[PDB]
Amino acid sequence: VPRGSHMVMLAQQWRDARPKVAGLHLDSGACSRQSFAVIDATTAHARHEAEVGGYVAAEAATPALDAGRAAVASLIGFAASDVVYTSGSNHAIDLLLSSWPGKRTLACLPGEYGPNLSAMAANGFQVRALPVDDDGRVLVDEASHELSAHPVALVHLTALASHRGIAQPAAELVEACHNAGIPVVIDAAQALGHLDCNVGADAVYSSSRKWLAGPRGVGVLAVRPELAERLQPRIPPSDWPIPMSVLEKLELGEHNAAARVGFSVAVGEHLAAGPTAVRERLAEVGRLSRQVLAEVDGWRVVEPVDQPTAITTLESTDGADPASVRSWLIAERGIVTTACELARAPFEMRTPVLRISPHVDVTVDELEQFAAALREAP
Amino acid sequence: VPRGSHMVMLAQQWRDARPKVAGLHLDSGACSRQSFAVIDATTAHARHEAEVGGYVAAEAATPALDAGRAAVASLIGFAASDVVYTSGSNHAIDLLLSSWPGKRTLACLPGEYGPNLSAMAANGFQVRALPVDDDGRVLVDEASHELSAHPVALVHLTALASHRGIAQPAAELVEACHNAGIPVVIDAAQALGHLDCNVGADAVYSSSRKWLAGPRGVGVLAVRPELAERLQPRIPPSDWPIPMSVLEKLELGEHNAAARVGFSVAVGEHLAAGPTAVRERLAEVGRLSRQVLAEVDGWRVVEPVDQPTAITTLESTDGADPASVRSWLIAERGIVTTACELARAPFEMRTPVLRISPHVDVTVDELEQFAAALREAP
Ligand SMILES: *Cc1c(COP(=O)(O)O)cnc(C)c1O
Ligand SMILES: *Cc1c(COP(=O)(O)O)cnc(C)c1O
């Protein structure tokens, strides 16, 4: 017996702070939609660069930039001074792993994001898999045993995977890993702004452009000071003249400053709307999605029906190619989606999937238009 | 006997395509000023990301992105398909040097940009100095002898230094290096849009935000195919599943797409205005600057008076600190400048300098206001 949507003003306020969608956007897990305020804040900084000078404009923006660090810090339980800006989540993990001291061994999910594995390998890490259930959810007790008996230099948990909408039990794993005396890094690229990311991790990173609906080309890396000062940044070399802290070294480099102030506005908007309220809505968006897609011929829903996420993935039962379906949906029906290849999670995925990832604004009629379009798809 | 300025409509068209400066901007070598068109083009893409989807918007922008590659390619004598987007010039040299095969030995100017040296070191290069005159200009014949007798895996020429406005004889050095059978990389961060960068180099890189007046957070790297396919990118590892070309690997990663289309508009504007005409104007801006600053007490001009560049640097003769002067000029008189520390060119600079780097729009009255303000400076 299905249930109605809990009506909340939040959904509409969100939709109306953003430009009108052309068709139908179900792809906030890939790239969400900047508010007018975010777009204006970015444009404004670029204009200011042109008036007063680019570096003086950047200096004058330290208030807003610091605000953004702090808002991020509050969402993860770190201090604002532990937080640093990056180009994105891949930049973030590379900065971290390339800086890591001593024995480079880690454990992670089998469903680990492929480009993360790529970076792990490129930085000379030995990578072991953590024990999981049939869905890819970590088994926390078994993981505890495994890590006590067989130690590793760090654990890398993707709290929410790009290819499947399973909420990982982050907090429970973090205390298990700490009991074994092992630090935890968290890939919160999908999770930040979506799951409770206040779980006592040692490092966390994420991306601007996804659930926080900020500009592309920005991410964040946060590292606790105990860990931060053990790190040995690749650039500059460790025997270099100009003395600066580890986090100052990691944040070093040319970047789009405007996009960073854009981001700060965007986290601001998340906090303003209420983290907890937004997350409960996204969880409900997921419920409704899986109810509506429960019965489509040629597609089965992969996630349990009451996982607290907005990510819902569909596997074809008659050998249809999601990349093609995605293309059709865009060109013909203006419906934006993501096709996840095996390369996204090579040691878990056996077959590609179609991923919907709608934000708070989605309606039940919109989920029906998708299901309709999904039926009459070549 | 001084000479008048060659009046050209170019100066004014440029000024009027940009926002009104608040005070006086003499710092295009650090960060220039985006045109209204550039700013609008960037904003437009971000808005489009929000309507049609971020990745579909990026795909739809391939025309403009490819245009920008091509415009860059024409300025350096490469093919558009040799050109790739980066975060900036430091990103560029790191991508290149981290990818370099076999024996890692190079020669460069003693006046090499400090962060370049830092990257060279971090990638395990042995770095030798090329012979130069008193100004830091390379002596081409002596360099030819040195390289024949004592070979090196590549030569890194900064065609125009950040700390001093010496135009390096790039073309003449490139043929000398090729005669010795040695490839040449060029740091054209200051030179692109400023000097003739069509000189037959094997690789060239530059930055969006300087003389081409594009967005921050963007640069370009161009590599000839002979060299490109010998390169072995750090990420992904060389034994990785997904097969793609070297340049495709280097351009991989999250980035601000909007800023890239911004950049394309900006190179467009340079080509539209006429490279050769713009360069001759910048050269004249330099002449006028050095005439006007010829006699200031407590400051001497460093560059010969007829170097074809807009970069003019001042050394204090009564132990004044340029960082302080720069700060005063901004806070009190709204004049934007750059203070170059020793760390910018550690193996050449003995003492800090104040750097002016005005674009085509500068007037002679503006250069007088600076000289005036430079006299009554604490
Ligand atoms: C989006 C994604 C990333 C990649 O981050 P970039 O911002 O593209 O560098 C990382 N991990 C997850 C789980 C992803 O969904
Ligand atoms: C500006 C500058 C750079 C640094 O490039 P980024 O865009 O800041 O990464 C490189 N070399 C020269 C000569 C510089 O002036």
Numbering used by the authors:
A (entry chain A), B (entry chain A): -6 to 371
The authors write:
One of the key steps in the ergothioneine-biosynthesis pathway, the C-S bond cleavage reaction, uses the pyridoxal 5′-phosphate dependent C-S lyase to produce the final product L-ergothioneine. Here, we present the crystallographic structure of the ergothioneine-biosynthesis C-S lyase EgtE from Mycobacterium smegmatis (MsEgtE) represents the first published structure of ergothioneine-biosynthesis C-S lyases in bacteria and shows the effects of active site residues on the enzymatic reaction. EgtE and Egt2 are PLP-dependent C-S lyases in EGT biosynthesis, leading to the conversion from sulfoxide 4 to EGT. Each MsEgtE monomer has 15 α-helices and 11 β-strands and is classified into three domains based on the domain assignments of NcEgt2.
The overall structure of MsEgtE was determined with a resolution of 2.8 Å and in good agreement with the X-ray crystallographic statistics for bond angles, bond lengths, and other geometric parameters, which exhibits two molecules per asymmetric unit. The PLP cofactor is buried within the conserved active site of MsEgtE. The PLP-binding pocket is mainly composed of residues from the central domain and a loop from the neighboring monomer. PLP covalently linked to Lys203 via a Schiff base linkage in monomer 1, with NZ-C4′ distance of 1.3 Å. The O3′ atom of PLP forms a hydrogen bond with Gln183. The pyridine ring of PLP is sandwiched between Tyr106 and Ala182, which shows that the aromatic ring of Tyr106 and the sidechain of Ala182 provide hydrophobic interactions at the two sides of the pyridine. To strengthen the orientation, a salt bridge forms between the nitrogen of pyridine and Asp180. Besides, another salt bridge between the phosphate group of PLP and Arg202 also anchors the position of the PLP cofactor. In addition, the phosphate group of PLP is tightly bound via hydrogen bonds with Ser82, Asn83, and Ser200, which forms an extensive network of hydrophilic interactions to further limit the movements of the cofactor. Conversely, in the monomer 2, the Schiff base bond is broken, resulting in the increased NZ-C4′ distance of 3.0 Å.
